[PDB]
Every structure is written in structure tokens, then in C-alpha cells.
Design a protein around this ligand. Structure first.
Ligand code: HEM
Length: 154
């Protein structure tokens, strides 16, 4: 898939707002994911034990990981499709070390869109959401192809 420049522009414009509060967005997104798809919480031995949203909210380790997640994602989006080098070590650890099925990437994609829509509605209208969804689909399709190369797929 190929995004146009206009689409990239919509993505990076909303991402610029996210980067005003990286820690806050990372928390919201991960909490959104664990609530909506409790199965994903299970893959994190580090967080497996958190029982409620408040514990999640109060967890500094969780906030730290959300920063790490969003920094890695931001670096990928800013490459505007040219992200082969950034994707390789990420595919390898998620497929081989952490054992994450491809499906869970769609779940986090959903969470990201939910949170941007909630916090940035003036900069996340229908066209901007379509562009972000395209950017994340591009991402997931490239990660899936790497999974297959690496021996996992799924
Ligand atoms: C937007 C997609 C994602 C990005 C950019 C991302 C990025 C990262 C990064 C940068 C790390 C730390 C270094 C590494 O181990 O590679 C990490 C660790 C990890 N990721 Fe992801 N991740 C994503 C999605 C997911 C999903 C969907 C899951 C599970 C449902 C997941 C589970 C994990 C686990 C289990 C760790 C290790 C945490 C620890 O105990 O330190 N990742 N991720």
C-alpha cells in the first residue's frame, strides 16, 4: 500500500499533538487495550497482576512502557512508509521472544484510534481517521510479512 503525502500530513499533524503528552497518551492507549481485550494483558508478565483500571493508572512501570511503545511507533510513522529498518527488530522480538499473534496488533490499532478520537476530535475528523487507519494497516501488513519470513505468522 502507498499513502499519499496529504494522508501522511494528516497523520503527522495529529501525531504532533500526541507528542505534547507522550506519557499520558501511552497510558490511555494501553489501558484502553487491556480493558477492551483482556487476553492481551496476559502476554505481559510485568503487568499480568493488575486487576483494575485504577491500579493500571497508578502503575509507573506501565506508564514507562507506554512511552516506549509510542516512541517506537512515532519513529515508524515519521518515516512515511520507509520503515524497513525500524520494523525488523520489532517483528523479531514480538514474534520470537514475546510470542504475540498478529491479531493483537489490530486490537492495539483500535485502541490508538479510539484514544485519538476522544482526545483530538478537531484534528481527527473522518479524513484524518481514514489516513491514520491506512498508516496502521500499512504497518500491520508489513509486520505480518516479516512474521512469515521469521517463521511465525499468526
Ligand atoms: C503498535 C505496536 C507496538 C509497538 C510499537 C510495540 C513496541 C514495543 C517495544 C519498543 C518494546 C520493547 C523492546 C522489545 O521487546 O521489542 C515492546 C515490548 C513488548 N511488547 Fe510491544 N509493541 C507493540 C505492540 C504490542 C502488542 C500488541 C503486544 C501484546 C498484546 C505487545 C507486547 C509486548 C511485550 C510482552 C513486551 C515486553 C514488555 C516487558 O516485559 O518489558 N507489543 N513493545
Amino acid at each position: 500500500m502507498v499513502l499519499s503525502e496529504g494522508e501522511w500530513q494528516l497523520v503527522l499533524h495529529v501525531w504532533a499533538k500526541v507528542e505534547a503528552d507522550v506519557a499520558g497518551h501511552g497510558q490511555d492507549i494501553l489501558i484502553r487495550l487491556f480493558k477492551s481485550h483482556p487476553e492481551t494483558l496476559e502476554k505481559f508478565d510485568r503487568f499480568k497482576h493488575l486487576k483494575t483500571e485504577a491500579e493500571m493508572k497508578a502503575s509507573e512501570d506501565l506508564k514507562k512502557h507506554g512511552v516506549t511503545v509510542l516512541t517506537a511507533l512515532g519513529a515508524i510513522l515519521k518515516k512515511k512508509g520507509h520503515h524497513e529498518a525500524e520494523l525488523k527488530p520489532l517483528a523479531q522480538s514480538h514474534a520470537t521472544k514475546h510470542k504475540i499473534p498478529i491479531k493483537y496488533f489490530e486490537f492495539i490499532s483500535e485502541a490508538i484510534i479510539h484514544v485519538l478520537h476522544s482526545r483530538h476530535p478537531g484534528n481527527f475528523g473522518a479524513d484524518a481517521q481514514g489516513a491514520m487507519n491506512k498508516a496502521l494497516e500499512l504497518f500491520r501488513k508489513d509486520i505480518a510479512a516479516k512474521y512469515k519470513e521469521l517463521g511465525y505468522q499468526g
